[PDB]
Amino acid sequence: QASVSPYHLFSDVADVTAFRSNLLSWYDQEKRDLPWRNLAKEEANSDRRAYAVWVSEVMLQQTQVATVIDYYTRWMQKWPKLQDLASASLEEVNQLWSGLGYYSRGRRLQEGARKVVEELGGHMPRTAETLQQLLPGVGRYTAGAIASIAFDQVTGVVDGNVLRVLCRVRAIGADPTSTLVSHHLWNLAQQLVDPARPGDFNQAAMELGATVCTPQRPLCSHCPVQSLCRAYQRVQRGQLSEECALNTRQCQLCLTSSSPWDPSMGVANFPRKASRRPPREEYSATCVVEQPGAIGGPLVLLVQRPDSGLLAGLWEFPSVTLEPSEQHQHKALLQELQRWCGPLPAIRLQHLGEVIHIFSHIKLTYQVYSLALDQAPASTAPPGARWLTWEEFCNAAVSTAMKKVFRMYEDHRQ
DNA sequence: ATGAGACGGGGACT
DNA sequence: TAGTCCCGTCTC
Numbered sequence: 406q407a408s409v410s411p412y413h414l415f416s417d418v419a420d421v422t423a424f425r426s427n428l429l430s431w432y433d434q435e436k437r438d439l440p441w442r443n444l445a446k447e448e449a450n451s452d453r454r455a456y457a458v459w460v461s462e463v464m465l466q467q468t469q470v471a472t473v474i475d476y477y478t479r480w481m482q483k484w485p486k487l488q489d490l491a492s493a494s495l496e497e498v499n500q501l502w503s504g505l506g507y508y509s510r511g512r513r514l515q516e517g518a519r520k521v522v523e524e525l526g527g528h529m530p531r532t533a534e535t536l537q538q539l540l541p542g543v544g545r546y547t548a549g550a551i552a553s554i555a556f557d558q559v560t561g562v563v564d565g566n567v568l569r570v571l572c573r574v575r576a577i578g579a580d581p582t583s584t585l586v587s588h589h590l591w592n593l594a595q596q597l598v599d600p601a602r603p604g605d606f607n608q609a610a611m612e613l614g615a616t617v618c619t620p621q622r623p624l625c626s627h628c629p630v631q632s633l634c635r636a637y638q639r640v641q642r643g644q645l646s647e648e649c650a651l652n653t654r655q656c657q658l659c660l661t662s663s664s665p666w667d668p669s670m671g672v673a674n675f676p677r678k679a680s681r682r683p684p685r686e687e688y689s690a691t692c693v694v695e696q697p698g699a700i701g702g703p704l705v706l707l708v709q710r711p712d713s714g715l716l717a718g719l720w721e722f723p724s725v726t727l728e729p730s731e732q733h734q735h736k737a738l739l740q741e742l743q744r745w746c747g748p749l750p751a752i753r754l755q756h757l758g759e760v761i762h763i764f765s766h767i768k769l770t771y772q773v774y775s776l777a778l779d780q781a782p783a784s785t786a787p788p789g790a791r792w793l794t795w796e797e798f799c800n801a802a803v804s805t806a807m808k809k810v811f812r813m814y815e816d817h818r819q
Numbered sequence: 820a821t822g823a824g825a826c827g828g829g830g831a832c833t
Numbered sequence: 834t835a836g837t838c839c840c841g842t843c844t845c
């Protein structure tokens with residue numbers, strides 16, 4: 406309902422004015438140097454400016470700034486314009502994305518650029534609503550980031566950083582993933598975003614959550630919005646010797662509930678921590694088959710995953726899925742290897758060790774093998790088989806799991 | 820037809 | 834050391 410207590414609202418316009426001014430003044434003296442800020446500040450063309458912002462905001466989804474920087478630079482140097490990206494192949498996109506994770510982001514970014522160039526004359530949509538509707542991979546966050554940063558639209562955003570900042574600043578301790586709490590956070594973000602500098606405000610709020618209002622041990626003594634933070638105000642009471650008026654059980658007859666407030670956590674009582682369920686275990690066997698090749702050998706066999714599901718369309722060493730009880734077997738692996746190599750001397754199969762790779766939702770254990778051939782396969786290389794030099798593999802569209810497998814193969818090789 | 824699960828990898832910190 | 838948290842979009 407609209408009957409939330411003023412304890413969780415900014416009912417005083419003076420507080421809103423001060424929140425914006427304090428945050429932006431801190432940003433103007435503390436802001437990190439980032440390549441997408443540099444490209445954006447100097448690109449007067451709106452479409453080129455939005456493209457540079459769009460790429461960075463897709464790469465930043467569930468990925469830390471420190472990781473993105475090098476990928477962003479590589480991407481913008483290879484595809485400086487929408488037009489360049491639209492002509493790229495998905496295979497080239499996966500090559501550049503290799504190691505960044507959540508690979509559908511890269512595919513959708515290319516699909517979007519192709520749509521913009523080939524259906525919209527190269528012109529990016531100019532509001533959060535139309536960016537979200539028309540561009541694949543662009544949800545509510547990315548659309549608001551592009552619109553505010555690139556087009557000066559007055560629209561607030563809630564990423565993980567802003568969620569944490571707002572839950573402390575207004576002492577929201579309920580499950581933040583619920584529809585009700587999420588709606589309240591977006592409403593706060595829309596109230597607070599500076600109408601004159603909405604992009605800088607959004608960037609400032611996110612960088613505050615990244616560098617000051619951090620998940621653990623936040624730097625409250627260094628915070629520009631300290632005086633306006635409910636979380637901070639409460640910690641400074643402690644053994645008190647301002648609170649939420651409507652936080653009383655409607656029932657005055659039941660046992661009176663007690664506060665789950667943990668004094669030893671301070672402002673980190675907010676937000677509530679998401680309870681995490683461990684990933685399911687899966688098992689696979691994989692083999693680096695090698696042949697001597699010519700100059701720059703040996704060559705290793707790579708094959709392409711299905712274009713759906715996990716790590717879709719990426720390349721990998723031939724692999725088979727195994728049930729736990731049969732995770733050390735060779736039968737199915739050798740059958741898969743012979744698909745791509747013809748008849749194989751199965752005596753050469755060398756067990757190297759195991760590689761455990763953690764996805765967000767799967768703990769995958771590979772039994773890793775190698776099979777070194779004395780010469781090329783007897784038959785011509787089948788369609789879908791790629792024989793790569795070590796350097797080509799390192800630059801190919803492969804998952805990090807397969808790079809760990811390759812590093813195990815390189816170590817055990819003599 | 821909505822909401823939990825699918826979907827990668829690593830940085831920071833204990 | 835080994836463990837933990839957490840940096841959005843889409844669907845099946």
Ligand code: SF4
Pocket residue numbers: 570573574617618619623624625628629630631634636637672
């Ligand atoms: S005072 Fe502390 S808890 Fe509040 S916003 Fe600043 S860093 Fe976060």
Ligand SMILES: [Zn+2]
Pocket residue numbers: 410412413649650651652
């Ligand atoms: Zn309350």
